[PDB]
Amino acid sequence: TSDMEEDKDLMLKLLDKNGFVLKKVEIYRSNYLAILEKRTNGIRNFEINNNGNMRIFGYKMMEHHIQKFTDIGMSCKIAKNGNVYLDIKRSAENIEAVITVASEL
DNA sequence: CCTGCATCCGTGAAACCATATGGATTATTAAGCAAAGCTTCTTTTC
């Protein structure tokens, strides 16, 4: 969707803004991937699904980071190896909120 | 030397340095996978 395009525009705007460099930005399963450079704060990528949900996924994230993203109301799915899903709705205010909580981790 | 007594031994009721090193542990990614979801063909209903 073009809303996913514009939310990609503000996403790269606020990740490029806040000094969080990217490994690669990928359209994969027709979904966006704002992948972090290193596994910083136990986080892998800042992805966008086309199903109205931008998602933050990681590997062995600390609990207090997860609490900081449930401050802005995000779902989580831990795995058996430390893989953690973080669901939020894809919107510009959620772009600003997720990248401003990620910008203070 | 060999007969004759004694006994006695068995026997059961500290700290460190240094240097590899590899094996153990952790992260990271490709594969795959079950589950879901289009696309058309029959099947059942009025």
PDB file of C-alpha atoms (C1' of nucleotides) in Angstrom:
ATOM      1  CA  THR A   1       0.000   0.000   0.000  1.00  0.00           C
ATOM      2  CA  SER A   2       0.974   3.639  -0.426  1.00  0.00           C
ATOM      3  CA  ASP A   3       0.319   4.185   3.286  1.00  0.00           C
ATOM      4  CA  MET A   4       3.062   1.611   3.812  1.00  0.00           C
ATOM      5  CA  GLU A   5       5.164   3.708   1.410  1.00  0.00           C
ATOM      6  CA  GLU A   6       4.611   6.944   3.346  1.00  0.00           C
ATOM      7  CA  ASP A   7       5.121   5.149   6.645  1.00  0.00           C
ATOM      8  CA  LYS A   8       8.352   3.839   5.139  1.00  0.00           C
ATOM      9  CA  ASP A   9       9.211   7.478   4.343  1.00  0.00           C
ATOM     10  CA  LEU A  10       8.713   8.678   7.917  1.00  0.00           C
ATOM     11  CA  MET A  11      10.290   5.441   9.197  1.00  0.00           C
ATOM     12  CA  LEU A  12      13.540   6.032   7.299  1.00  0.00           C
ATOM     13  CA  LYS A  13      13.190   9.712   8.210  1.00  0.00           C
ATOM     14  CA  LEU A  14      13.168   9.019  11.949  1.00  0.00           C
ATOM     15  CA  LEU A  15      15.683   6.165  11.922  1.00  0.00           C
ATOM     16  CA  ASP A  16      17.998   8.185   9.684  1.00  0.00           C
ATOM     17  CA  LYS A  17      17.222  11.109  12.005  1.00  0.00           C
ATOM     18  CA  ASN A  18      17.999   9.404  15.321  1.00  0.00           C
ATOM     19  CA  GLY A  19      21.366   8.005  14.190  1.00  0.00           C
ATOM     20  CA  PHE A  20      20.221   4.368  14.075  1.00  0.00           C
ATOM     21  CA  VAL A  21      22.013   3.071  10.998  1.00  0.00           C
ATOM     22  CA  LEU A  22      20.568   0.232   8.954  1.00  0.00           C
ATOM     23  CA  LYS A  23      21.978  -3.034   7.673  1.00  0.00           C
ATOM     24  CA  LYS A  24      19.623  -3.190   4.685  1.00  0.00           C
ATOM     25  CA  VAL A  25      16.093  -2.057   3.838  1.00  0.00           C
ATOM     26  CA  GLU A  26      14.282  -4.858   2.044  1.00  0.00           C
ATOM     27  CA  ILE A  27      10.931  -5.520   0.397  1.00  0.00           C
ATOM     28  CA  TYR A  28      10.538  -9.158   1.451  1.00  0.00           C
ATOM     29  CA  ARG A  29       7.259 -11.089   1.177  1.00  0.00           C
ATOM     30  CA  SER A  30       6.202  -7.617  -0.050  1.00  0.00           C
ATOM     31  CA  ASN A  31       7.014  -6.352   3.451  1.00  0.00           C
ATOM     32  CA  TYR A  32       9.484  -3.727   4.636  1.00  0.00           C
ATOM     33  CA  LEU A  33      12.524  -4.485   6.785  1.00  0.00           C
ATOM     34  CA  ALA A  34      14.214  -1.633   8.653  1.00  0.00           C
ATOM     35  CA  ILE A  35      16.941  -4.013   9.762  1.00  0.00           C
ATOM     36  CA  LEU A  36      19.364  -2.739  12.390  1.00  0.00           C
ATOM     37  CA  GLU A  37      23.076  -2.837  11.607  1.00  0.00           C
ATOM     38  CA  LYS A  38      24.119  -4.838  14.662  1.00  0.00           C
ATOM     39  CA  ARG A  39      22.017  -6.710  17.194  1.00  0.00           C
ATOM     40  CA  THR A  40      21.647  -3.612  19.341  1.00  0.00           C
ATOM     41  CA  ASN A  41      19.628  -3.930  22.584  1.00  0.00           C
ATOM     42  CA  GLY A  42      18.944  -7.509  21.511  1.00  0.00           C
ATOM     43  CA  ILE A  43      16.964  -6.199  18.523  1.00  0.00           C
ATOM     44  CA  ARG A  44      17.284  -7.387  14.923  1.00  0.00           C
ATOM     45  CA  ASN A  45      14.946  -5.405  12.684  1.00  0.00           C
ATOM     46  CA  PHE A  46      12.255  -2.719  12.610  1.00  0.00           C
ATOM     47  CA  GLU A  47       9.914  -4.271  10.075  1.00  0.00           C
ATOM     48  CA  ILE A  48       6.614  -3.323   8.467  1.00  0.00           C
ATOM     49  CA  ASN A  49       4.023  -5.878   7.498  1.00  0.00           C
ATOM     50  CA  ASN A  50       1.394  -4.909   4.949  1.00  0.00           C
ATOM     51  CA  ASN A  51      -1.342  -6.049   7.351  1.00  0.00           C
ATOM     52  CA  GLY A  52      -1.523  -2.663   9.101  1.00  0.00           C
ATOM     53  CA  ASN A  53       1.057  -3.675  11.713  1.00  0.00           C
ATOM     54  CA  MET A  54       4.600  -2.372  12.000  1.00  0.00           C
ATOM     55  CA  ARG A  55       6.652  -4.809  14.041  1.00  0.00           C
ATOM     56  CA  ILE A  56       9.867  -4.727  16.073  1.00  0.00           C
ATOM     57  CA  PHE A  57      11.613  -8.091  16.223  1.00  0.00           C
ATOM     58  CA  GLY A  58      14.733  -9.030  18.126  1.00  0.00           C
ATOM     59  CA  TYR A  59      16.962 -11.671  19.674  1.00  0.00           C
ATOM     60  CA  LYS A  60      17.440 -11.736  23.465  1.00  0.00           C
ATOM     61  CA  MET A  61      16.047  -8.313  24.199  1.00  0.00           C
ATOM     62  CA  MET A  62      16.091  -7.266  27.833  1.00  0.00           C
ATOM     63  CA  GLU A  63      12.855  -7.152  29.810  1.00  0.00           C
ATOM     64  CA  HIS A  64      13.030  -3.417  30.521  1.00  0.00           C
ATOM     65  CA  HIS A  65      13.178  -2.609  26.797  1.00  0.00           C
ATOM     66  CA  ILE A  66      10.023  -4.724  26.365  1.00  0.00           C
ATOM     67  CA  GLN A  67       8.465  -2.744  29.207  1.00  0.00           C
ATOM     68  CA  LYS A  68       9.456   0.495  27.458  1.00  0.00           C
ATOM     69  CA  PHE A  69       7.666  -0.633  24.306  1.00  0.00           C
ATOM     70  CA  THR A  70       4.625  -1.820  26.234  1.00  0.00           C
ATOM     71  CA  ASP A  71       4.551   1.738  27.568  1.00  0.00           C
ATOM     72  CA  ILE A  72       3.470   2.748  24.055  1.00  0.00           C
ATOM     73  CA  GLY A  73       1.268  -0.341  23.875  1.00  0.00           C
ATOM     74  CA  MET A  74       2.960  -2.991  21.745  1.00  0.00           C
ATOM     75  CA  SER A  75       2.368  -6.717  21.679  1.00  0.00           C
ATOM     76  CA  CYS A  76       5.201  -9.187  22.148  1.00  0.00           C
ATOM     77  CA  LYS A  77       5.892 -12.804  21.255  1.00  0.00           C
ATOM     78  CA  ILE A  78       8.916 -14.379  22.888  1.00  0.00           C
ATOM     79  CA  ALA A  79      10.322 -17.529  21.348  1.00  0.00           C
ATOM     80  CA  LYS A  80      12.134 -20.532  22.777  1.00  0.00           C
ATOM     81  CA  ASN A  81      15.506 -19.057  21.754  1.00  0.00           C
ATOM     82  CA  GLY A  82      15.035 -15.371  22.614  1.00  0.00           C
ATOM     83  CA  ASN A  83      13.296 -14.135  19.473  1.00  0.00           C
ATOM     84  CA  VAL A  84      10.858 -11.388  20.436  1.00  0.00           C
ATOM     85  CA  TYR A  85       8.012  -9.917  18.374  1.00  0.00           C
ATOM     86  CA  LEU A  86       6.592  -6.453  19.047  1.00  0.00           C
ATOM     87  CA  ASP A  87       3.350  -5.571  17.293  1.00  0.00           C
ATOM     88  CA  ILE A  88       2.038  -2.057  16.795  1.00  0.00           C
ATOM     89  CA  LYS A  89      -0.339  -0.573  14.251  1.00  0.00           C
ATOM     90  CA  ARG A  90       1.368   1.052  11.264  1.00  0.00           C
ATOM     91  CA  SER A  91       0.761   4.778  11.716  1.00  0.00           C
ATOM     92  CA  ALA A  92       2.873   7.936  11.721  1.00  0.00           C
ATOM     93  CA  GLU A  93       2.252   8.549  15.428  1.00  0.00           C
ATOM     94  CA  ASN A  94       3.327   4.972  16.081  1.00  0.00           C
ATOM     95  CA  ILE A  95       6.400   5.649  13.926  1.00  0.00           C
ATOM     96  CA  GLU A  96       7.251   8.615  16.143  1.00  0.00           C
ATOM     97  CA  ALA A  97       6.436   6.675  19.323  1.00  0.00           C
ATOM     98  CA  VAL A  98       8.323   3.478  18.456  1.00  0.00           C
ATOM     99  CA  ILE A  99      11.363   5.345  17.185  1.00  0.00           C
ATOM    100  CA  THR A 100      11.305   7.675  20.213  1.00  0.00           C
ATOM    101  CA  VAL A 101      11.222   4.720  22.620  1.00  0.00           C
ATOM    102  CA  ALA A 102      13.899   2.954  20.572  1.00  0.00           C
ATOM    103  CA  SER A 103      15.800   6.259  20.644  1.00  0.00           C
ATOM    104  CA  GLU A 104      15.904   6.172  24.467  1.00  0.00           C
ATOM    105  CA  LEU A 105      16.730   2.502  25.088  1.00  0.00           C
TER     106      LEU A 105
ATOM    107  C1'  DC B   1      67.765 -86.262  63.808  1.00  0.00           C
ATOM    108  C1'  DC B   2      63.969 -86.919  65.985  1.00  0.00           C
ATOM    109  C1'  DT B   3      61.048 -87.352  69.314  1.00  0.00           C
ATOM    110  C1'  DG B   4      58.608 -83.940  72.229  1.00  0.00           C
ATOM    111  C1'  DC B   5      56.664 -79.378  74.103  1.00  0.00           C
ATOM    112  C1'  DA B   6      55.450 -74.136  73.035  1.00  0.00           C
ATOM    113  C1'  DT B   7      53.406 -70.883  70.459  1.00  0.00           C
ATOM    114  C1'  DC B   8      51.186 -68.689  67.412  1.00  0.00           C
ATOM    115  C1'  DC B   9      49.148 -67.659  63.586  1.00  0.00           C
ATOM    116  C1'  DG B  10      44.548 -68.803  61.151  1.00  0.00           C
ATOM    117  C1'  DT B  11      39.501 -69.199  61.398  1.00  0.00           C
ATOM    118  C1'  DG B  12      34.649 -69.487  62.066  1.00  0.00           C
ATOM    119  C1'  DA B  13      30.546 -67.974  65.672  1.00  0.00           C
ATOM    120  C1'  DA B  14      50.642 -21.679  47.406  1.00  0.00           C
ATOM    121  C1'  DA B  15      50.194 -18.804  44.248  1.00  0.00           C
ATOM    122  C1'  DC B  16      50.825 -16.907  40.019  1.00  0.00           C
ATOM    123  C1'  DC B  17      51.954 -16.196  34.899  1.00  0.00           C
ATOM    124  C1'  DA B  18      51.525 -17.435  30.430  1.00  0.00           C
ATOM    125  C1'  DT B  19      50.018 -19.469  26.488  1.00  0.00           C
ATOM    126  C1'  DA B  20      47.586 -22.034  23.569  1.00  0.00           C
ATOM    127  C1'  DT B  21      43.111 -24.040  22.327  1.00  0.00           C
ATOM    128  C1'  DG B  22      39.576 -25.989  21.293  1.00  0.00           C
ATOM    129  C1'  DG B  23      35.610 -27.031  22.747  1.00  0.00           C
ATOM    130  C1'  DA B  24      31.940 -25.191  24.417  1.00  0.00           C
ATOM    131  C1'  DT B  25      28.712 -21.536  23.923  1.00  0.00           C
ATOM    132  C1'  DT B  26      26.298 -17.865  21.460  1.00  0.00           C
ATOM    133  C1'  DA B  27      24.345 -15.372  17.367  1.00  0.00           C
ATOM    134  C1'  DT B  28      22.905 -15.413  12.643  1.00  0.00           C
ATOM    135  C1'  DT B  29      21.104 -16.893   8.731  1.00  0.00           C
ATOM    136  C1'  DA B  30      18.914 -20.149   5.030  1.00  0.00           C
ATOM    137  C1'  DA B  31      15.521 -23.577   4.640  1.00  0.00           C
ATOM    138  C1'  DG B  32      11.369 -25.212   5.439  1.00  0.00           C
ATOM    139  C1'  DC B  33       6.804 -25.700   7.066  1.00  0.00           C
ATOM    140  C1'  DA B  34       2.234 -25.850   8.625  1.00  0.00           C
ATOM    141  C1'  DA B  35      -1.238 -22.975   8.152  1.00  0.00           C
ATOM    142  C1'  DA B  36      -3.731 -19.783   5.464  1.00  0.00           C
ATOM    143  C1'  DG B  37      -5.689 -17.953   1.425  1.00  0.00           C
ATOM    144  C1'  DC B  38      -6.900 -17.272  -3.986  1.00  0.00           C
ATOM    145  C1'  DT B  39      -8.893 -19.921  -8.211  1.00  0.00           C
ATOM    146  C1'  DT B  40     -11.762 -23.078 -10.579  1.00  0.00           C
ATOM    147  C1'  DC B  41     -14.982 -27.457 -10.625  1.00  0.00           C
ATOM    148  C1'  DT B  42     -18.393 -30.010  -9.004  1.00  0.00           C
ATOM    149  C1'  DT B  43     -22.770 -30.455  -5.953  1.00  0.00           C
ATOM    150  C1'  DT B  44     -26.747 -29.476  -3.941  1.00  0.00           C
ATOM    151  C1'  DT B  45     -31.039 -26.452  -3.798  1.00  0.00           C
ATOM    152  C1'  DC B  46     -35.413 -24.300  -5.394  1.00  0.00           C
TER     153       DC B  46
END
